[PDB]
Amino acid sequence: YQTNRPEASKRLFVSQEVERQIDHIKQLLTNAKLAWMFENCFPNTLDTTVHFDGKEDTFVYTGDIHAMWLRDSGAQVWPYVQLANKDPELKKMLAGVINRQFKCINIDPYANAFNMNSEGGEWMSDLTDMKPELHERKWEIDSLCYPIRLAYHYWKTTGDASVFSDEWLQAIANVLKTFKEQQRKDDAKGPYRFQRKTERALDTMTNDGWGNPVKPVGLIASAFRPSDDATTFQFLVPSNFFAVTSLRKAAEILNTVNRKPALAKECTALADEVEKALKKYAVCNHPKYGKIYAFEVDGFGNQLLMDDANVPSLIALPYLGDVKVTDPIYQNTRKFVWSEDNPYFFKGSAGEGIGGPHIGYDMIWPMSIMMKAFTSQNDAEIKTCIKMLMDTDAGTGFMHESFNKNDPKNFTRAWFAWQNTLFGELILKLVNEGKVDLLNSIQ
Amino acid sequence: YQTNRPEASKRLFVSQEVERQIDHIKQLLTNAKLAWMFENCFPNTLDTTVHFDGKEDTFVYTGDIHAMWLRDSGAQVWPYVQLANKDPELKKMLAGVINRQFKCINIDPYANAFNMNSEGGEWMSDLTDMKPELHERKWEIDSLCYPIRLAYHYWKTTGDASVFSDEWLQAIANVLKTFKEQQRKDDAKGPYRFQRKTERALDTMTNDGWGNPVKPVGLIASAFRPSDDATTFQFLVPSNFFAVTSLRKAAEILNTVNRKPALAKECTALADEVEKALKKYAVCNHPKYGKIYAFEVDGFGNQLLMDDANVPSLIALPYLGDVKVTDPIYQNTRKFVWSEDNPYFFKGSAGEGIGGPHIGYDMIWPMSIMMKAFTSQNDAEIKTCIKMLMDTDAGTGFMHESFNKNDPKNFTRAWFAWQNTLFGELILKLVNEGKVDLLNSIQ
């Protein structure tokens, strides 16, 4: 069993603390394959996607796609924050990620993906206001939430508030302006419009680029989902939940750090409005599972019952910390999403899980399985999830975007940094929780 | 007030009975504008779209779009059937339409539009199995229902069953095969797949061309709506209702005419299954309007609450005769669709009505207003509808596809034969019902 990591000399970024961490788990885990996968995945982001300038800037690619997603980057380095206090170089690189994310938001708060400079790209021709610094401009609420989540954890972990300077002040102001604009209270259309000539229905918006209408009930419209697919009803519930928590984190930062009570109150006020609207528009009395959370709503009364593997998702609500795992409505939702009553839940001879319209029928995303484990309150459940991830890797030793429910050999995206980071994060979390014996019991 | 009809010498098809009909209403109506519009609209199909070979074939164009829609053609000549018993040439032309429709269905029961021969067209490159005889291959349930509706009315009206020969036998068999295939009980995918590289989200299907998943509860999946837009949840309720009635009509034909009890029973059995599934999947307990009919459902539990102007529609249910106008659930639905709770109901300074995602926000389709009048049980309501159609024609004296809720001058499709036929049909129906005094009361 030889590692699939590039090579000491080919690795883009090296973190000694990270290296010490995998050494520990390797000698701690008794399953050769599991340890092998952890060594390949956990450091993947550092090994092949991190571009640190040694100063205050860090550019992070997603892997397969040569660009930087605010979402992917915010998650790709997330599990490293807990090691920053023991690695000065790592800590500086993390601050560089945050600094770059905030600069991206200020370039275009509606964009989901950015280029290192201004090389533009194939999507420059999209029917929307483009800029050479952008790789893609699909409006996704979670794009603005992930950076805040990272910066907050970073700050609380290291105590370093140097990342909350002028750039941050402008970015947070742009997040509020964009969130408010997308509540679409004044006009059903607005500043953001998007269409693209493609054969993929969810890569373009309906109604001349304005998307399906929404009734301004206080929720924030999201043109696209964290899966990069267009929403059916724009008030994406999982992303709105993520927005509430992110706004509250920013408010705490603006208060204790920048000491700007006015701007913080705006964050809090918006969070309260979105949270109240969620409580009366995002809940559905399902006849089989009881009260559950809808995936998307339009404010007119329509509610889409389903779930997509991409985080933020309904099942991942507790992972991001938007709801307690004990939330009764969440538990009911958890049962629903992992059943044949969810149009995107698939089950075959290779395993089961949630997929989405992005790849299509029978294609399950391991991300959904990992989130099931991350939010699990039962060791037996966690064990089956880990083993399933192990048996559906097609011997590549990496995490893929999706695989066929009847044949893992049929999979997409062999190099998905965000997914590998999540797997390393899961195993590390389990270990730090004293569940090593559980992992070591894997056949 | 000079007529907008082409010219006696430029008219494609001439019907003396039709000419006598407009002469009667002209001297009967006291409103110059109304009479003018009736003379322009009622005969529009005959004046500019009918191509009769003098034998057993009739090709009918839609007008703006140079092709034949099974849907449009079946409606464009509908109101003429009641005059066939007094016009031999007209009667033969109607039989030629039916004959051509059945031949189309046998060419490709999944296609919605056909060419006169095999000139192909711009959609030949669509990501689906194309044929030069086809103009477009968007699967729309109503495409197979409209021809049956016409043939049945024709037969019951004239007594001529010569249209139910070998071609009809093959076509009806194709309708059953196609309907059954689209219940998608054996596989969530099937023989029909469709995608197109376009910027219009509803001109392509999600999930690699298979559309959004459906749970095989007995309903028939419809890839696209009578508006030519892709469905969100494939079990289109209005079209499934239309399917039930059409199947029952065909069963009666197969029994009394072709005397084939076996094939007829298959039609009846399918109708019963679809009807039962409608009763338990297409109904929604709306908290504001009570029990109403959903627009589309997926069988998993999702229900789309809205309405589109294109017939078959929810409001037009009684018009096509799929439900009694007295149906309580229909009445509740009628209130809902004509309110701000319907995402596609628009109201402005020019008037109000239903539109759809096809053209976009604020664009109301007069078809919705006409259907409101057609299904109305109140003279006052009918009067406002007629006057609204009169005040939103932009002085063109014709029926348009849609107009801006705040400015009728902003409209689409100046030449829409199907719509003109419907307006002439509405006025004629009102007159034959002794409501001339009502029309003559229009200011």
UniProtKB/TrEMBL annotation, chains A, B:
GO terms for biological process: carbohydrate metabolic process. Keywords: Signal. The keyword Chloroplast does not apply. SMART domains: DUF1237 (SM01149). Pfam families: Glyco_hydro_125 (PF06824). InterPro entries: 6-hairpin_glycosidase_sf, 6hp_glycosidase-like_sf, GH125. It comes from the Bacteria. PANTHER family: MEIOTICALLY UP-REGULATED GENE 157 PROTEIN (PTHR31047:SF0). This is Glycoside hydrolase family 125 protein. It comes from Bacteroides thetaiotaomicron (strain ATCC 29148 / DSM 2079 / JCM 5827 / CCUG 10774 / NCTC 10582 / VPI-5482 / E50).
